[PDB]
Symmetry: C3
Subunit: 248 residues, 3 copies
Amino acid sequence: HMPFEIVFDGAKEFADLIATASNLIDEAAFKITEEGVSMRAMDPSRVVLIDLNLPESIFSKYEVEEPETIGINMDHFKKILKRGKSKDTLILRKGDENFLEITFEGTAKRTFRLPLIDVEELELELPELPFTAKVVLLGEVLKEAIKDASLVSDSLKFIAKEDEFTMKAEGETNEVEIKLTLEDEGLLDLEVEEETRSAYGISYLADMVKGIGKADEVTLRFGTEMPLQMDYFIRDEGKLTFLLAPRV
Amino acid sequence: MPFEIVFDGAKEFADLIATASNLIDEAAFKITEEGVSMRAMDPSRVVLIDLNLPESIFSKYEVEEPETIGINMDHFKKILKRGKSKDTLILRKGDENFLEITFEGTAKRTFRLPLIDVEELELELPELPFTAKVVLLGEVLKEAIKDASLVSDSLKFIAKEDEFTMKAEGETNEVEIKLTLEDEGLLDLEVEEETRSAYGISYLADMVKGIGKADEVTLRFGTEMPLQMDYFIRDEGKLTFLLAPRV
Amino acid sequence: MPFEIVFDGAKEFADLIATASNLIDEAAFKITEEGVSMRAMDPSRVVLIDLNLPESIFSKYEVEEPETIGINMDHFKKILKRGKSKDTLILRKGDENFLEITFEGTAKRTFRLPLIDVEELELELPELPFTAKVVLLGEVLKEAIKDASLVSDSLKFIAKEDEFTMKAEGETNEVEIKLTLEDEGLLDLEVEEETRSAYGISYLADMVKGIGKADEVTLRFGTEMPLQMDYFIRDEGKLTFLLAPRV
């Protein structure tokens, strides 16, 4: 568990990214290597897999001596990171001691000490699934569609066809449809091998998109009765990926 | 019975309906060739609301034949709150018994709202012998009601020739909001005799909750008489409340 | 008659009163020809607060009859919270037993706040042998206190000739906020000798809650001595807290 020093310019942006992962998980193992920081975890119900990848290219200083895995209480990490200001420099540092030193450098130098925990790691792979539909859309559209559907139902049907992407929710008497074509502003890309239909739990979807930005380009990949893969990019280079089991 | 009604600016429409739903739970909307109208009373029958949305405020207005639809106002307002400020709002009725509510913006979002039937009533909005008229900024009215609520549950309106006063008093605390024509908040005052009435603050608060700070609000009242309060929507629409006085 | 006091910017006045009401419930305001002063303690007798508002910060200052009035700070603050940023505030004491609080803006809004009897102690604001002086941005002070509260119930203040540190430590967790003159948050540092004291975070949080992020706050303390925290109102007014150290 060697020392390292990792520096990110923009503490609040980093906190927001961590906050998005923390919405679903409580504890996480962070793999720190020379190439970057990665984290893979499942939510407690084992319905969502989260994969975070932060290559060294997004850090203004990146000094890792030997690869190591550190365990982190995500609630306590997020609570500290939330104190970072938008212009703060964030420094994540480890010495010989078994804690993480979290420093915000801005109008003052503020250093927190976060105890490291033991996180027993599951065997988790991010499989390459045969998705038959790909959608790139503005986060604003995706976030509102999930909110719109929650007025109506507990589940949201995703329907991809050659020229239109539809999210549809139906209640006992009440119903909502959110429809995008490439003529629409909210839709950046649509690729459909065959017409694809799946449905997903809104409570999970709401937790996945809560932290996503309204201007972020979110990529969706899914298949008929297959999981939904949802990702967006951090500084174009890092990537947060969710894999969500379909509602059966 | 098809119709199609289009309003540019969904959030503004939501705000307008939100004002009415503060006192109303269910409403019949009369949809004719000339515009949309709605008239309803709060559950205690203390406040009458009248909403008139002429054809001229809609960007597209296509009514086949006049008809009346009943709407649960809380459900309507919940859907309409999903509209964004730059959305186009489309209100469409096919041959079925549901109102199709579409927001067209970055995406096309269509809600289906089931229609209900509403006990329609002997509701007219008569013209009473009001003796005072006050036009004032919504900011002044809203703040005066909030101010008086610190003090009491009733607000006394007092109009004289050159002054309009709203006064409230508790057992020791008191507040007076005074307006003369030299005040930026008072846009017009017409007083044909000294006029004095009092109204319940809980009703007033619900009436002004949705009014904008820069909306121009017209008050008409008489002594121990109802209060008529109205403001205009896109200049041509009109929202009118008639409020029973308090003893 | 006995006095009329006018302050331009009612909301700014409310914010200043609101800071003091965070620690105190009741206060005696002494109105003299020179200005308004107030001195009080929190219920636990841990914090002394001193407010001095010279006549120079008021647009009109007329004290015919000097006197001292007793005010419930919660009621005072509730009324002052109704003032708008552009309102003129008028404090008027008539012959009677109430304070007249008027907001003059788009309208004239007058509240009557009944005066109360406050058992006044003789509170001295002592000269103390402070060995460290720190001038820092309110933003840094307020954040440090918030940071420390994630960790502990008390915050250590450590001043050395070139650095000011606030440190909190829990069972296992720890935070350190460090300032040097190189840092934007530190405006002045004067250290007669190494100085270390600790203070309850719950008190500090209440002291700084109303202070602005842009405000310039002066701290003075000594080893195992009280903390004196002051900031200026319109350059000439001054709000001072004196906080007992913690053991």
